[PDB]
Design a protein around this ligand. Structure first.
Ligand SMILES: Nc1ncnc2c1ncn2[C@@H]1O[C@H](COP(=O)(O)OS(=O)(=O)O)[C@@H](O)[C@H]1O
Ligand SMILES: Nc1ncnc2c1ncn2[C@@H]1O[C@H](COP(=O)(O)OS(=O)(=O)O)[C@@H](O)[C@H]1O
Ligand SMILES: Nc1ncnc2c1ncn2[C@@H]1O[C@H](COP(=O)(O)OS(=O)(=O)O)[C@@H](O)[C@H]1O
Ligand SMILES: [O-][Cl+2]([O-])[O-]
Ligand SMILES: [O-][Cl+2]([O-])[O-]
Ligand SMILES: [O-][Cl+2]([O-])[O-]
Ligand SMILES: [Ca+2]
Ligand SMILES: [Ca+2]
Ligand SMILES: [Ca+2]
Ligand SMILES: [Ca+2]
Ligand SMILES: [Ca+2]
Ligand SMILES: [Ca+2]
Ligand SMILES: [Ca+2]
Ligand SMILES: [Ca+2]
Ligand SMILES: [Mg+2]
Ligand SMILES: [Mg+2]
Ligand code: NA
Ligand code: NA
Ligand code: NA
Ligand code: NA
Ligand code: NA
Ligand code: NA
Ligand code: NA
Ligand code: NA
Ligand code: NA
Ligand code: NA
Ligand code: NA
Ligand code: NA
Ligand code: NA
Ligand code: NA
Ligand code: NA
Lengths: 510, 510, 255
């Protein structure tokens, strides 16, 4: 289909002969420089390559507010997610309209030149409520208030080069390249499948059914840009996709990585996704249950209805110009060994089965066996390998402030004790001295599977530098993960308490 | 047999009623304090429990030189290894005879009170040559010149408590306790087996043969104090021993950990070992091939003859008062599936087999399969787990000084590249800033299995803070582990070079 | 078809006899391989018959046997080609063979050794191992020698309790025979059943014939004792360790 807006805005192609000139202006000591934030790098790449056609820069206030209140650009073009360049007051104050800024990656690689159209201070509450539905726990809203700059800079781009990536060089196909890919193959019907999770059996069936319904080839188009916090890293997912792609009949599917930065914005994002895939050459786009939805909030309520995206996408149907293949909860059928849309069964006459991602983590974290029917073995293997069960996980024991015994001796006692268990885990008494350069390493070790014995707490002003993950507090306090009887409880007693606690939580298995 | 010298010098027992008093003197602000070095902690423990009977303190010059030149204490008592309290000039100068010093552990636990007899400055070259045979590579000699103090303090001890241990509380039996153990069992004939390595099939057969020959029970008496540099840690070995002990017939063997600090002194040490085992209640002591020998030097020559220890022990036979069970190279017999002393076979008529420890490390480092006949499976499992094959080992790539490319970008490239391989390894760009508190952590990560990308070298004055292990230098220099074509070689080129190098050395397997 | 013949292990003569018998039974051909009906070698290592005497004898009566004989030379294994073949149509060193004599076959059967996939079918080896178990599943007897000076009652109990702690499915029993042949004749039955017997006293030499020597060991100071004692009054724990290690050495116990 025609790219959204009618013209693929591949600015790398457009500005090619200006490459050298733009590069010189980018490195000239007089120009103002902004180092792109991670999410911005994702966005900037989708704007420069045509993925966000018709966009050609970051939204000015006029287009931005139109998108917030109208799900459309100022000119009426259907567009649901605001793409802006968020900066801080300091930087915002050094720019005026007509100014030209150099956009860098890693304060070293010049990406593009942005020509300023305006500098405004968005009402984050409105954006949060009109675009992401208001819940403070919604991922997009948390980013907007805790990570995003309080100033937006609308303006047009002139491309120097897409953001730098040293991984999967062959796979991050640009809209132009994908289209060429489909052509060399004479693929004129392609149904794209969005995703941010590893694909399991349900999804393989889901995508093949779509392939069959639409009479089209399959495009696994996963996000490797930025997804829901706590998601499986894209490296692991890529390995999973590459593995599962082999279970498709020869020549039916194509894999391409999309450096998109999701907002986990349910229905609106679904619309945005469809526009994006259309630019990339797809003729069909799947929209299953709770598409781009972040599940439930701490209170158990849904951020979006499991089918809000489908309804919204349906309502813009006549102007999306890319056919949407909707799917209802695809689930497992024990008694018949096969999956099927829940909309075409049940009646109690048929018994289903469904292993939610929740419980999926649970078995991964507990070395539990994951059903042959649920996911392919090679896939589960890759997953366990990246997310090991507790007996292979790292952790830390922090000797609480209330601790009266010799921290030096209690430390050694724990070390020598853990050491006798064996099991390949590396242990260390780790003294941080409140130096963030040391604190920031704590999660590295835990990530590496090591067990750390930390003799002292770190000041509360530093608590943010340390990832709470697998970090237990040994103390008399009620807020201690491992509660002691008294601050001066004898070492061997404290030791047994720590060991049995770790054993209870699966870190040790005898 | 009677402890060496006739009287078990169990000073803990002896000084019991002085415990409180000694403890008070030890913590009095007026007394001079020396914090025991690791090896000293091992020695002090064998002196206070009777293990070094007839010793009751650290050798004064008179006894010390008699041991060096006569293999005997000043009074004639057979004794081959000098046990001295080595200190630095600074401390040496603060003491005179009659002075009482408090000996602490971890500058916190008071171990004993040493009454000074003399303070001398040993000629380390004579000790090195007469006691350890002079080769600068010999482990004991290296310790003597690079770790030992240049001053010795002779003097008698008064025990407060044996050095503190939090691991294997039940297993570190003292001479008094072992003897009771043997008695409760009515064991009056016990052959002890010394060792610093994991026990394999040969050893199990070797010890049972000795049990059969001597008509005695088996005592596995492994060293967990200090051994040959690069040995398997004692925790792993203890797990190996506890596992292999089950392969003995019910009630034929007993396990006990010996906190001895070996000197790897071949024949002399064997004499010393036999004296120590006699104090511990043994009636027989095994002395196999190259007992307590450190193998060969860099030039390939032997530190000791494979049977020097046997000859030396044989010559003191009538005064050791503990029977020695000598063994020649025990080897494997394929065609008959059984082991046997090489002295009772060969003639070419029989074909043998022998997997040296060398080649044993090799398979352990290469994930190679280790023969069913060589060692029990449960044992190899424990070993592989403590010494994983390369694909599970950590490492560091240090961006050489000669590097002209962007270190920041080359670092990222390697990170992203390694990230796509997967396999459970944790990666990190690690900036040390020449701070030893960071440098000293490099080997911790490697130990934890992580891969580190280090953008800059550390100043030569710090090089000693970092363990050379699995640390590779990427540079144009000839001394670079991974040699670059030019200092400005393009990143993808450098990356492929680093990846293929690591693949070639087994860190990556596809 | 099962033939209730009583062989004489008479090499060549028997082969002639066998061929006559097979002819009566309806056969038109009879095979005569290497050392047919031969009992191998005597204690001095010499052959009772030449490996092909039977073939020669059968060949000489060929015209009156009236049953055709199919002769075969040593059929052996060919590693490199995975196949068997008559030795008469190979060798020349150009080809390497392989041959697991019955001797060595018993050896592995008695030592739980693995018997080559090429040598015999698995289902067959299974049936054999099951009828002729390896040592760790075999029975045996320890006979307390005459020279024994220690309490036979206490030494018996000690060995019983000791063996009992090893476990492994073997049944144990202190077995008093009282020189009664009705009891002696049962000794091999238990051994056959896999049990371990502790026998406090020897049986009079006139009865020795009633007992099968198989897996029966003599614990004594004598030189003819299978398990030799230092002195007739060696302390029990010492004697016990000696008996345990001896049995361990001969595979009856595996830890
Ligand atoms: N069981 C299912 N039934 C129907 N659709 C599904 C099912 N599971 C996943 N999908 C669809 O698969 C696509 C990607 O799934 P996910 O990776 O879990 O999350 S999403 O944030 O990208 O939507 C979405 O269209 C989603 O609705
Ligand atoms: N193959 C062997 N043949 C004879 N003796 C051996 C053999 N292997 C090890 N030993 C003996 O086993 C004891 C301990 O072995 P090791 O742990 O390797 O080394 S040692 O440093 O404690 O001597 C020594 O008496 C040694 O000589
Ligand atoms: N390897 C062999 N090569 C040739 N003939 C063999 C071989 N093995 C067994 N035979 C033959 O097989 C027949 C029966 O073999 P056996 O049961 O071992 O012994 S026999 O006592 O009945 O002759 C005989 O004709 C014997 O010569
Ligand atoms: O299905 Cl993934 O969440 O593991
Ligand atoms: O025997 Cl050890 O060297 O592994
Ligand atoms: O001797 Cl038989 O072939 O077992
Ligand atoms: Ca703000
Ligand atoms: Ca719901
Ligand atoms: Ca108290
Ligand atoms: Ca010095
Ligand atoms: Ca040699
Ligand atoms: Ca150059
Ligand atoms: Ca012959
Ligand atoms: Ca006697
Ligand atoms: Mg890119
Ligand atoms: Mg101790
Ligand atoms: Na920089
Ligand atoms: Na509001
Ligand atoms: Na259609
Ligand atoms: Na809704
Ligand atoms: Na169209
Ligand atoms: Na619990
Ligand atoms: Na004695
Ligand atoms: Na301290
Ligand atoms: Na002896
Ligand atoms: Na020699
Ligand atoms: Na003596
Ligand atoms: Na190589
Ligand atoms: Na003949
Ligand atoms: Na005839
Ligand atoms: Na033997």
């Amino acid at each position: 289909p025609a790219p959204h807006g009618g013209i693929l805005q591949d600015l790398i192609a457009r500005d090619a002969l200006k490459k050298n000139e733009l590069l010189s202006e980018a490195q000239s000591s007089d120009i103002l420089v902004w180092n792109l934030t991670p999410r911005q790098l994702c966005d900037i790449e989708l704007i420069l390559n045509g993925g966000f056609s018709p966009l050609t820069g970051f939204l000015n206030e006029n287009d931005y507010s139109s998108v917030v209140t109208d799900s459309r650009l100022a000119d009426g073009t259907l567009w649901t997610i605001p793409i802006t360049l968020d900066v801080d007051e300091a930087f915002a104050n050094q720019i005026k309209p007509d100014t030209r800024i150099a956009l860098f990656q890693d304060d070293e690689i010049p990406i593009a030149i942005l020509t300023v159209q305006d500098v405004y201070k968005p009402n984050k509450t409105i954006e949060a409520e009109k675009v992401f539905r208001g819940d403070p726990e919604h991922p997009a809203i948390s980013y907007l208030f805790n990570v995003a700059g309080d100033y937006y800079v609308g303006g047009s781009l002139e491309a120097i080069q897409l953001p730098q990536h040293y991984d999967y060089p062959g796979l991050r196909k640009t809209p132009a390249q994908l289209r060429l890919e489909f052509q060399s193959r004479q693929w004129d019907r392609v149904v794209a499948f969005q995703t941010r999770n590893p694909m399991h059996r349900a999804h393989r069936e889901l995508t093949v059914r779509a392939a069959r319904e639409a009479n089209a080839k399959v495009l696994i188009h996963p996000v490797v840009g930025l997804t829901k916090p706590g998601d499986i890293d894209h490296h692991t997912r890529v390995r999973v996709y590459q593995e599962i792609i082999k279970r498709y009949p020869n020549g039916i599917a194509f894999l391409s990585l999309l450096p998109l930065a999701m907002r986990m914005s349910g229905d609106r994002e679904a619309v945005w996704h469809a526009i994006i895939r259309k630019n990339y050459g797809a003729s069909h786009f799947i929209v299953g249950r709770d598409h781009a939805g972040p599940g439930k909030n701490s209170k158990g309520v849904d951020f979006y209805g499991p089918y809000d995206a489908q309804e919204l996408v349906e309502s813009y149907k006549h102007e999306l110009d890319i056919e949407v293949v909707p799917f209802r909860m695809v689930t497992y059928l024990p008694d018949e060994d096969r999956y099927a849309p829940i909309d075409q069964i049940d009646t109690t006459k048929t018994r289903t089965l469904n292993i939610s991602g929740t419980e999926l983590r649970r078995r991964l974290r507990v070395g539990g066996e994951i059903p042959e029917w649920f996911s392919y073995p090679e896939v589960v293997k890759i997953l366990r390998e990246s997310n090991p069960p507790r007996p292979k996980q790292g952790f830390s024991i922090v000797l609480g402030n209330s601790l009266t015994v010799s921290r030096e001796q209690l430390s050694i006692a724990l070390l020598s004790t853990f050491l006798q268990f064996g099991g390949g885990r590396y242990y260390k008494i780790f003294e941080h001295n409140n130096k963030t350069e040391l604190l920031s390493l704590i999660q590295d070790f835990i990530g590496s599977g090591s067990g750390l014995i930390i003799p002292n707490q770190w000041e509360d002003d530093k608590d943010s530098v340390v990832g709470k993950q697998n970090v237990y507090l040994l103390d008399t306090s009620s807020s201690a993960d491992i509660q002691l009887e008294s601050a001066d409880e004898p070492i061997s007693h404290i030791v047994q308490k720590v060991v049995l606690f770790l054993e209870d939580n699966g870190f040790f298995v005898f």
